[PDB]
Amino acid sequence: GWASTADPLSNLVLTFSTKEDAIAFAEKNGWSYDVEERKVPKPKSKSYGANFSWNKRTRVSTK
Amino acid sequence: KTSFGSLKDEDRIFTNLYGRHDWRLKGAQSRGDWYKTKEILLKGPDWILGEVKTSGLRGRGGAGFPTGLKWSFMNKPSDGRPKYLVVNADEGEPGTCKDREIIRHDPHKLVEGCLVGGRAMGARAAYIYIRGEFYNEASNLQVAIREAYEAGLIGKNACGSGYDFDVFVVRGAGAYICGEETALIESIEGKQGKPRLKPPFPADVGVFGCPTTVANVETVAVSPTICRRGGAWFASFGRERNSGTKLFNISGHVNNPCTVEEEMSVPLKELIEKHAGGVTGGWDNLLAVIPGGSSTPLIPKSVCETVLMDFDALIQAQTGLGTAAVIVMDRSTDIVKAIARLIEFYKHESCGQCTPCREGVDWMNKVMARFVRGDARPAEIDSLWEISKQIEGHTICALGDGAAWPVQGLIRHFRPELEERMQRFAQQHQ
Amino acid sequence: ALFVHRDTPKNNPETPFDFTPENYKRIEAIVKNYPEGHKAAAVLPVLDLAQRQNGWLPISAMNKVAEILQVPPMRVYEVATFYTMYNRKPVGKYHIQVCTTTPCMLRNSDSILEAIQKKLGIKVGETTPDKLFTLIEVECLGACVNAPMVQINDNYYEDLTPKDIEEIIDELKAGKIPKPGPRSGRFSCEPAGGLTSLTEPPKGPGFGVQAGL
Numbered sequence A: 001g002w003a004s005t006a007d008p009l010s011n012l013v014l015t016f017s018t019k020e021d022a023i024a025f026a027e028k029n030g031w032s033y034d035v036e037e038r039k040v041p042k043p044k045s046k047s048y049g050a051n052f053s054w055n056k057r058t059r060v061s062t063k
Numbered sequence B: 001k002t003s004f005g006s007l008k009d010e011d012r013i014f015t016n017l018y019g020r021h022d023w024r025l026k027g028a029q030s031r032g033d034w035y036k037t038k039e040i041l042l043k044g045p046d047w048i049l050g051e052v053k054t055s056g057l058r059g060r061g062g063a064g065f066p067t068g069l070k071w072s073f074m075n076k077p078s079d080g081r082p083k084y085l086v087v088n089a090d091e092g093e094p095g096t097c098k099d100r101e102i103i104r105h106d107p108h109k110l111v112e113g114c115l116v117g118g119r120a121m122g123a124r125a126a127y128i129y130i131r132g133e134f135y136n137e138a139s140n141l142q143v144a145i146r147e148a149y150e151a152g153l154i155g156k157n158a159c160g161s162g163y164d165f166d167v168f169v170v171r172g173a174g175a176y177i178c179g180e181e182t183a184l185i186e187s188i189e190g191k192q193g194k195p196r197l198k199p200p201f202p203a204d205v206g207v208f209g210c211p212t213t214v215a216n217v218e219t220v221a222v223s224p225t226i227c228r229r230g231g232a233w234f235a236s237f238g239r240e241r242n243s244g245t246k247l248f249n250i251s252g253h254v255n256n257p258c259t260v261e262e263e264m265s266v267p268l269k270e271l272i273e274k275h276a277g278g279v280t281g282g283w284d285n286l287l288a289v290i291p292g293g294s295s296t297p298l299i300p301k302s303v304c305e306t307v308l309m310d311f312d313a314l315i316q317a318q319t320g321l322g323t324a325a326v327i328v329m330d331r332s333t334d335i336v337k338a339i340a341r342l343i344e345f346y347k348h349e350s351c352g353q354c355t356p357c358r359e360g361v362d363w364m365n366k367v368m369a370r371f372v373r374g375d376a377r378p379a380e381i382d383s384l385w386e387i388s389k390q391i392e393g394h395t396i397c398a399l400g401d402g403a404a405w406p407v408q409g410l411i412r413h414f415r416p417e418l419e420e421r422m423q424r425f426a427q428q429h430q
Numbered sequence C: 001a002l003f004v005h006r007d008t009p010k011n012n013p014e015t016p017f018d019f020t021p022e023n024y025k026r027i028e029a030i031v032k033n034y035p036e037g038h039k040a041a042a043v044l045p046v047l048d049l050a051q052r053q054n055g056w057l058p059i060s061a062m063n064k065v066a067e068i069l070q071v072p073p074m075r076v077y078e079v080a081t082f083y084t085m086y087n088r089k090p091v092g093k094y095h096i097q098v099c100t101t102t103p104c105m106l107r108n109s110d111s112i113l114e115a116i117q118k119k120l121g122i123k124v125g126e127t128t129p130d131k132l133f134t135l136i137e138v139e140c141l142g143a144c145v146n147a148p149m150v151q152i153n154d155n156y157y158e159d160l161t162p163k164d165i166e167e168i169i170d171e172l173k174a175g176k177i178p179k180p181g182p183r184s185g186r187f188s189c190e191p192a193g194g195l196t197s198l199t200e201p202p203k204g205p206g207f208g209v210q211a212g213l
């Protein structure tokens, strides 16, 4: 009942420092490739004093 | 002036401390209270702040912060939000019972202090947070507030000065951590009494998010006397940056445990031998003194001989003035059991919000229980010292420091006694 | 001493509870003590008033407070469980609290505790079978110079000896409420050996007033 496969490229994971190096490596080896852009978290506005606002909805009910 | 103490009765701010005179408005008005208050309310906020900061009055809560700067932090134009003066009448520190006397016997002095302080920083109202256990004191304060309201001293057009001011009383529900100013602010708002993080300071965001100044009962009740008698009169007592008088509660193994007002730079030996009638068994029977309640490190007999009960000299004795609560233990006292009971009190009274106090104070409680039994080794003594150093300075509020300090004092001054205890347990139980 | 709630026939959400109309007026005054938009600041006094009316807090006063203040019931549960003055179990008619902190421990408070224990025939944390007394042990109560001392409901009994606390318990069993004060010679907080301070009459108004005021 083990998991059998016939794909030699099943565990092939390659690491590249930048996107263009990976693109050039894929294009050099004749592999049709797709590229997904890097998703970064946008900066937030953090305030500890917003938990105790006088008239805003951002008051905390407890702590 | 080098020697301090032996205060005359004419220089005492807190007359009728013992309750031998009338505590109501008629008796208080004959003792100088509510006198010429319209003049102080009409002389402006900045004049009151200057009179306060010329006297050099420091905060009587225990931190010892200067009062003039702290009160002038709210001397700014308002941005549509009201401003609040909040009086800390919790007094949960063991050994400290002065604020109970001030509330129970001189309530009108507290109300006049609330009005003068609120005029000094433009407060819309006043919220007095009394201890939940002080039901009779709270009812006395409510009676006095009703008498002041009915006489026109507070409320609409307070004292005929055109200033509008209300005084409210909020009763607690039995939590020592609610004595902390930010935890007090959170408890007034109907939440759990857990302290906030600073910044924001209460002058920026306080109760209901409004600007707020939290002040002790003792540092509020003296303010009308400061504005009336003058700042130089208050500064004439005590040393530099230790000006004025102070209420001391002497308790423990002493002949006459009592609350008494005295000059700020009084010697501890003179204070004990004069006002409290000396310790039991004479001065040679003294073993240790905790000078500022349970939040301060203790000092042995060899330090209390030549020490002065102000902020600076007690700081230089690697302890603190605290709330000026002198707890005295003689030679018939297990010091380890006393400090263990203190740590047990701190474990029971801990809000548990932030990690180091919540875990470490229970850890210290278990370690000191084994120390009392003697089931340990000196490596655990050094480990407890390191744990106490790890708790202190890494917490949200100052209860963690107040639980770390007594163990550090006990270790530093009585390591041989602890070591003898564990070695006699090891040689008896094996 | 459990901070979780389990449904019982004595304590269930269907247990009847409602405020009296005079207590409704008192609740209105308490709410009017606070700014508009911050009605939740009155959770503590209204819950204390509910405990004062009932004697303890089942889970029907908590829901009633949450309903009349428009706050979530979880916040009322947090408030009730955080503070030690609120009773979530039915205590007796006289709730004796003995302070055993170090300034009271130095003045032999455990003698008072064992005196109460052998007078009532119970131990700490237990209730008498006739539901008249409850004996627990508390922290400092702000009467440290009047140590040793106990608190029975609102009243403070200070400077007690075993004979004095036995007299207090015997008088409480007879139905008469004693005087809430120290049983020694002193009245409130003065030294026992006379007044070492404040022995002069106070000077009165206009004494020591600075010029220009």
Ligand SMILES: NC(=O)C1=CN([C@@H]2O[C@H](COP(=O)(O)OP(=O)(O)OC[C@H]3O[C@@H](n4cnc5c(N)ncnc54)[C@H](O)[C@@H]3O)[C@@H](O)[C@H]2O)C=CC1
Binding pocket: B060, B061, B062, B063, B064, B065, B070, B073, B091, B092, B093, B096, B179, B180, B181, B201, B202, B214, B295, B296, B320, B322, B323, B397, B398, B402
């Ligand atoms: N009176 C009592 O019952 C007890 C007193 N204490 C004592 O209280 C003290 C700890 O209390 P805390 O108020 O937490 O400590 P403390 O360091 O912070 O602060 C005292 C006051 O000064 C204000 N403050 C200080 N620096 C400021 C700045 N840069 N800007 C604005 N405001 C500033 C704070 O807001 C606070 O109101 C200790 O000395 C401890 O011994 C401890 C336990 C019980």
Ligand SMILES: Cc1cc2nc3c(=O)[nH]c(=O)nc-3n(C[C@H](O)[C@H](O)[C@H](O)COP(=O)(O)O)c2cc1C
Binding pocket: B058, B059, B060, B061, B062, B063, B064, B065, B070, B088, B089, B090, B091, B092, B093, B176, B177, B178, B179, B180, B181, B182, B214, B215, B216, B217, B219, B397, B398, B399
């Ligand atoms: C755990 C803890 C408990 C405190 N309890 C009180 C108290 O009961 N009464 C008090 O006046 N200050 C108490 N304080 C000190 C306050 O944080 C604050 O310094 C004080 O209320 C006002 O200081 P002031 O004397 O300069 O006006 C406590 C502080 C901590 C950390």
Ligand code: SF4
Binding pocket: B177, B195, B349, B350, B351, B352, B353, B354, B355, B357, B358, B395, B396, B397, B398, B399, B400
């Ligand atoms: S030090 Fe203790 S009492 Fe203070 S905030 Fe942290 S958990 Fe709460």
Ligand code: FES
Binding pocket: B094, B095, B096, C099, C100, C101, C102, C103, C104, C139, C140, C141, C142, C143, C144, C147, C149
């Ligand atoms: S230590 Fe018992 S009343 Fe304070």
